Design a binder for this molecule. Sequence first.
Ligand code: HEM
Ligand code: HEM
Lengths: 141, 141, 146, 146
Amino acid sequence: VLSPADKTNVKAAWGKVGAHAGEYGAEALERMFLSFPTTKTYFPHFDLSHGSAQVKGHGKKVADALTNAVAHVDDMPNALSALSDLHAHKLRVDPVNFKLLSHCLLVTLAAHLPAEFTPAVHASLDKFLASVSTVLTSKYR
Amino acid sequence: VLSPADKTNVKAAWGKVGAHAGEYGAEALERMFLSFPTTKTYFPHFDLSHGSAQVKGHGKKVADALTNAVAHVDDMPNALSALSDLHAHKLRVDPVNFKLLSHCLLVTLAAHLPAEFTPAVHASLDKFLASVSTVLTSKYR
Amino acid sequence: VHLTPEEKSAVTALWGKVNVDEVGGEALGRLLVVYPWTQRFFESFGDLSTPDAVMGNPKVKAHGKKVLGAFSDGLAHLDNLKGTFATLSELHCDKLHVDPENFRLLGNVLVCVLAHHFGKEFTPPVQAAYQKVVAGVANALAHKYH
Amino acid sequence: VHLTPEEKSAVTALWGKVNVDEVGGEALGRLLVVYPWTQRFFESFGDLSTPDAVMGNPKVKAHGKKVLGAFSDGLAHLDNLKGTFATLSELHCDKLHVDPENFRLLGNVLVCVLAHHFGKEFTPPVQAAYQKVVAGVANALAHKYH
Ligand code: HEM
Ligand code: HEM
């Protein structure tokens, strides 16, 4: 369960992410597709070439969904409702795939936030992400 | 998410295990140690030879806890709070090990309740074992 | 995969008593029933909403056996699962876009079905061997993903 | 280990820039902070109660170095990891009883520590190769469990 310190850690980290969030989300997707191709199976339609605009844009929707969840840290399950149906009902995305994307968000954030990516925040960001993935996977059957 | 039909199947299935629950928890423990030897890392203080008093005895504790769960399915998290504090704070078992124990349980049930082990029953027990697992893995961090 | 000769042996003996038509349908059918998302890839199969439909769908039962046939082929090339399943991998990845995590599930429902069939004859030791095969297979269908 | 020479080359070039002293400490450190159930294995290490107790714990810092040493020594033998780590897998299994699943956490935590130190230089393709390396180290460390 996210804690107060957690909550606070995450607001300060994502806050620095600020405007570059769409960028960070697409970088995340790139790291994933490259480091774990199995994930590609869920995007047989995207153009996944380095620099793809289909990715950059999808990247942004993820970043935003994340900012939204940031903004409703206390009611995440109901804020993300819509996305949990999508991922778990229309798409049906195995939950391991979320661990993977999660991992790449962290690496991505770690590569862009030296001062910020401290052990305690790293621990907070991982909890948050597990939290989001848990919501987004909640209605699987 | 345990649906009333799941619940109904879990009740209906277990009650057939009945006085064999103990004998079956043991077999599952046996199958797990043998199929997935890395789960053994958690039982170094045990004798894990074919049919050993510890495995037998520990088999009854697992089975018995499951029975507690069926009977209290409608409210599992409160009913297990204890067990849950034991497998997460002090013992701390990697969630993944639960998937292996649950799978072996089904092999056991599947192997002893031939008529009861229907596709739907199969299904429900899987959501059931999964639910127990989640309850048991919730209070780590 | 590294399979003891006693294991290579435990496996075959049992396999030889396997009713291919019966077990192929139950595996494939329980997969769709127990892990519902899988249905997405088979939706050109027809009605698959309710258990009975899935377990009685002749397009399921038939594919079921095709699947077990390919399994049968891997039990004979255990020392070379990769070369056998190479085309099946490409297919599953390039055509059908199946996430390999679903292979484990099939592999495991498969173990569930055998245990259901053979009863006490499916001992813990026998199970460990099949657990190893079923994993080898999955890894093998996942090798040519890119 | 499916590591194209191009992949193999990036790995090495990056690793030459690595301050193994420091990286080992950080990695083992974050592992104990981020997945604090992994602290049970090291109770001889003194205070682990706060992020700083850990990151600064000398026994942590020393052991981290040992760990990275074993790591570098695998990068000098990508082609026989199972052998390189055979004594060490065994030990972690038989004497320490560590769930091999923790080797993957360490690995991913390693990768985040590389990303933290190197920056944009830790590109998706270099990460990608690094993921192949940590997975192999991990598989190789679980290989002798029985
Ligand atoms: C189906 C999920 C599980 C349930 C319901 C369950 C239940 C239990 C119970 C009832 C106990 C005895 C605690 C007491 O005194 O009341 C126990 C202990 C224990 N469990 Fe589990 N368990 C489960 C899964 C696991 C798994 C997956 C592992 C690791 C592979 C595990 C490892 C242990 C260990 C090492 C103990 C200590 C036993 C001893 O030291 O004597 N358990 N569990
Ligand atoms: C490792 C176990 C599996 C094996 C050995 C296997 C093997 C096969 C085989 C032999 C074919 C037919 C190739 C042909 O007809 O020429 C096939 C087709 C197919 N496979 Fe798998 N499969 C496995 C698991 C799965 C999984 C779990 C799914 C998805 C849940 C899946 C999805 C499909 C689909 C959608 C087809 C095409 C069927 C059609 O509409 O004609 N496979 N597979």
